[PDB]
Amino acid sequence: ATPDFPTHFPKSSIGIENELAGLVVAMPANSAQKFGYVKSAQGDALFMLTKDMNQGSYQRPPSLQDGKNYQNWQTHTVELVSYPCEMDDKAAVETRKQAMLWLATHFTTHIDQSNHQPLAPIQSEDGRFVIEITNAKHVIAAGNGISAESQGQTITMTPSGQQATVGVAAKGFGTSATPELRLLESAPWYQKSLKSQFASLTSAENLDDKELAANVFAYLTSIYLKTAELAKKFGIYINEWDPMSEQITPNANGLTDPKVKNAWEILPRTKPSKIVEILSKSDAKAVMKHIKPQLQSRYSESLSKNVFQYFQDGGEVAGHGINNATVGDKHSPELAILFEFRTVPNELQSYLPKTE
Ligand SMILES: Nc1ncnc2c1ncn2[C@@H]1O[C@H](COP(=O)(O)OP(=O)(O)OP(=O)(O)O)[C@@H](O)[C@H]1O
Ligand SMILES: [Mg+2]
Ligand SMILES: [Mg+2]
């Protein structure tokens, strides 16, 4: 049992994803993504050990035949996924980086003397870190896992294998109140001009929280407009909208296609429809009613209707979202919305481990 991510943080939170180079994990087909985790000796979960990119079917090297069944097993790259922590918690950020670098050195020894064997649950030499194995039905192998012996690889990490995910209070997006919020608001798809635009459209309206409504409107409208732009650009089938009806040839497999996710740069990871909950029933109605013409003044009726309905019925920006994250008082929790930095920017590089 790999522990689930904590969902609540007092303020902004950060998680990291780190794909390793130099080895693979092989596991039975249709196995769970998580096969273990690393915790501090104190018991705090630091990161998960996961399979990531499928690298083809696993073939046990004949020189390592052990009478064991490896039928239908698949090879994957290994990705280290941190348990989120508070963005300003220096010790927690540092312990995650150090534990990942330690595990990479441990993997370097593992492929040298225990190639094509599962990782064992052990404690680090200095006693700082502990490996827990949740799926023993795995093997770790050097390189691409075809040869019985390694090429003496050092297990490494690189910016191209790294992402960071930032979680903030949903009510904060558009307020520019913190450096994290300002970094998120710098996303090219976010149109800050929409805040003042909403205020102009709703003067005769007596809104419960006009500034919160304007922020929600700018956030949702920016996402809806960007989705329509990407659907047109990449020829994506959204709801009932057919790109071929507008003479657009598909050039992506959908919203989850890595090139589509890369085009967001700062990728929303939370279901857009969740944000409506931060407003009163009345204010939410006013925000939603005003989004439709923003799409319709820029996109065809069919694309506008389909994007609007898609997000209204709880559609996700790019597959399964992180929709249960909260911020503030643990007792009266507030919605947190998450964002994935496809490439780690200079502002967040200090959160990522660097191979020495
Ligand atoms: N509350 C949180 N605050 C900040 N980061 C978080 C939070 N919860 C999870 N994360 C981070 O989110 C990332 C994992 O996202 P997720 O669990 O959705 O994976 P995934 O489903 O495989 O991703 P994807 O849908 O992009 O393929 C990690 O970096 C993790 O630390
Ligand atoms: Mg991941
Ligand atoms: Mg990622």
Is 327:11 a contact under the CB 8 Å cutoff?
yes
The experimental technique used to determine this model is: X-ray
Q: How far is CA 354 from CA 20, 104, 240, in A?
A: 11, 11, 45
Q: What amino acid occupies position 178?
A: T
Give the Cα separation of 66 and 50 in Å (integer): 25
Q: Give the residue, out of 44, 50, 76, 269, with the most ligand 1 atoms within 8 A of its beta carbon, to mutate for a pocket test.
A: 269
Give the Cα separation of 230 and 252 in Å (integer): 10
167 lines ligand 1 (CB under 6 A): yes
CA dihedral 345, 348, 353, 356 (to 10 degrees): 60
Contacts of 76 (CB under 8 A, 6+ apart): 24, 25, 26, 27, 51, 52, 53, 54, 55
CATH 1.10.3680.20 fits 187-323, yes or no: yes
Contacts of 149 (CB under 8 A, 6+ apart): 115, 142
Work out the number of other CB atoms within 10 angstroms of the CB of residue 285: 12
Residues placed in the known binding site for ATP: 13-17, 82, 269
Is 46:180 a contact under the CB 8 Å cutoff?
no
Give the Cα separation of 50 and 44 in Å (integer): 18
Which residues have their alpha-adjacent CB atom under 5 A from ion ligand 3? 17, 163
Beta bridge partners of 86: 13
291-296: which pairs have CB atoms within 8 A and are 24 or more residues apart? 291/217, 291/220, 291/221, 291/224, 294/194, 294/221, 294/224, 294/225, 295/224, 295/225, 295/228
Work out the number of other CB atoms within 10 angstroms of the CB of residue 28: 15
> Which protein residue has the closest C-alpha to ligand 1 atom 15?
322
Residue whose entry in the numeric block shows the structure tokens 């919160």:
212
Which ligand minimizes its atom distance to the CA of 52? 2
Phi and psi angles of residue 35, each rounded to the nearest 5 degrees, phi first: -120, -5
Question: In the chain, at which residue ranges do the beta strands (DSSP E only) sit?
Answer: 8-9, 13-19, 23-27, 34-40, 45-57, 74-82, 85-86, 129-133, 139-142, 162-169, 266-268, 326-327, 334-341
Work out the number of other CB atoms within 10 angstroms of the CB of residue 80: 26
- For every residue of 12-71, DSSP letters joined together read -EEEEEEE-BSEEEEE-TT--SEEEEEEETTS-EEEEEEEEEEEEE----GGG--S---T
Give the Cα separation of 268 and 263 in Å (integer): 12
Give the Cα separation of 25 and 27 in Å (integer): 7
Give the Cα separation of 328 and 168 in Å (integer): 10
Q: What amino acid occupies position 241?
A: W
Give the Cα separation of 71 and 59 in Å (integer): 9
| Chain Cα centroid distance, residue 80 | 12
Distance 33 CA to ligand 2 centre (A): 9
Per-domain residue ranges of the chain: 1-186+324-356, 187-323
Coil, helix or strand for 6? coil
What per-residue string of b and e applies to 164-190 under the rule 16 or more CB within 10 Å gives b?
bbbbbbbbbbbbeebebbebbbebebb
Distance 85 CA to ligand 3 centre (A): 17
Is 137:34 a contact under the CB 8 Å cutoff?
no
Element (H, E) at 249: none
